[PDB]
Each structure stands twice: as structure tokens, then as C-alpha cells.
Design a protein around this ligand. Sequence first.
Ligand SMILES: Cc1[nH]c(Cc2[nH]cc(CCC(=O)O)c2CC(=O)O)c(CCC(=O)O)c1CC(=O)O
Length: 318
Amino acid sequence: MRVIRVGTRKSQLARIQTDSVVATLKASYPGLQFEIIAMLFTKELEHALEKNEVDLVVHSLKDLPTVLPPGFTIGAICKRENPHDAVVFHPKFVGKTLETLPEKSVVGTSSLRRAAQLQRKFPHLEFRSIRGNLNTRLRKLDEQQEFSAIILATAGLQRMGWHNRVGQILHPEECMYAVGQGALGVEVRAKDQDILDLVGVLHDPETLLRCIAERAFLRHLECSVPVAVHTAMKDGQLYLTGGVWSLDGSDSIQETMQATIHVPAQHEDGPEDDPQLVGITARNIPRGPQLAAQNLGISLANLLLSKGAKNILDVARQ
Ligand SMILES: Cc1[nH]c(Cc2[nH]cc(CCC(=O)O)c2CC(=O)O)c(CCC(=O)O)c1CC(=O)O
């Protein structure tokens, strides 16, 4: 353990996210040296991991599939930023809400999950795909008049320093978030235990359990489907709400389940070589609550499946 090599894409958001993690690692490990190597695109980064070119990579958790290639694992789930979706309005609709927009106002989003939920809740608005990164989308919004508004993650605006552009934050009842949204995942080599121990300091127990539940739900249903969730840990209880929608949002199934899961306060010297749970390795967090969280997500998926979720999903791909 001497120089820690952190790989990163050249994009601005990826670069910011990577920096926030490196900052947190330096703070914990002031005596070590960290170096940033700037290069699904996920498979080029993984290749650099595979080749020992870098030791770790930072991702937005929702961009990581519930099943990772053998030889890689999520070594860290960092404290969640705000998970909710948000609305940025055209320069003409300040103070306005989705509720208050004019009929047939056009809302830009390329997300099936967002479009399906928002068409259902706002049948008088028009939802249309929009392309580009966050910067490009904001320019199109202000520089033309195709869009009366766009939908983006609260968390991404926040990290870009554009929170003041947020006109509306959506509640679960209007729009539930994507699995893992607002959380960062650090990906490493599954068998590299030094690195795993090192990044293990980043795990936020609460976010870790929430994301295990959410990703177990997602995986058991079997980025590119109209599925959404909401999680909360409150008073020793983990709450999981999940939903599935048809492309137009007309068909819908949503349910909530709950389980007693303590949020673990203390770390522990845990079993090396226990299997990762939904791609995640957290040997320093108690196993029990992790299993309980995964079981909760499995439970909810089965309930939705018994209610027809599979045929909704077969019709709602991308
Ligand atoms: C799986 C995934 N990854 C990203 C793209 C991406 N990946 C991470 C950030 C920010 C939030 C965080 O990092 O979770 C976002 C950008 C957006 O959600 O505002 C999107 C949104 C696509 C857009 O509407 O065209 C989705 C789909 C889901 O959200 O329904």
C-alpha cells in the first residue's frame, strides 16, 4: 500500500464524483498517496482494473448493473446524496410546477422510468426524449423553446453546482427514483483485499442497506426498464416501496414492504470470502442486516411478480 491509483472518465460529472471520493479517502488516509488516471463505457475502466492500471473506479451507483462481471465488485457505497428527481424549468416558467404548467407543455427526458411515471401523473403534459449531458440539456432548454422543462436527478445538479437551477423536487407520489440514485459506488478488483479494506472505510451503513434492498429488488425482477423505488430507514425499520409501469404509464403495480433491520453502528472483523451481495462487498459491516435487506428486496420483487409485473416488463424494454 503506497500509491493508490484512481481511474476516471474525462467527463465533468464523473471527474467531480471521483474527486469527492479521493478527498474522503485522503482525509482518512493522510499518509498515503493517491493518483488520478484520466481515461456501457464501464468496460474500459474495468479493463484498466483488470490490467492493474488503476486500483479503483468511482461510479454513479444506478449506472452499475445489478450483476457485475466476475473479478469485479462494489467495494464501497458512499453516503447517499438526495435521491429524488427534479425539474428544471424553461426561462419562462419560473415559480411554476409540473402541476402549473400549460396543457401540452413539453417535458424533456430520455428515461423510460421517468416518462412512464410522469405521463400517468400528468396526462396533460407531453414527454419527449432529449439528448446530451447535463450541460447540453440545460443549454437546449434555455436556448430553444422545444422544452418547457426537463427532468434530471437532484443529485447530479447538486454535484455540478447547479442546484439553483432546480425549480421543483419531485416526491415519491409524483415520481419514484431509480435504483441506487444519488449514491456513489466504488468498483474494485474482487480479489484485491488491500484495496477492499482501504475503500471499506467509505461504506455508509444506512445507504449500504437501502441500496442492497433496492438492487435486490431490481435484480430479482429480471437502467433500461420502467422500474422505480423508495427506501427509508427509520426507527430500526427499513421500508421499501417499489413499482413497475407500462411504457405509457397506464398499467402500474406498486407495493411497500417493511422489516426490522438494525442500522449497524460499529464495524467488525468479518468473514473474508463470504459472497458479495448484489455485486457489493462489505466485509466490515455486519452480515445479518445485509442479508435481511437483500431478503426484503427479494420479497417485494416476488409480490410484484405474482401481480403480473413480468408481462408489464416484457412489453416495456429499451
Ligand atoms: C440508469 C440511469 N442512468 C442515468 C444517467 C445518470 N447517471 C447518474 C446521474 C445523476 C444521479 C446520480 O448520480 O444517481 C444521471 C443523470 C440524471 O439522472 O439526472 C439515467 C437517466 C437518463 C436521463 O433521463 O436521460 C438512468 C435512468 C433512470 O434514471 O431512470
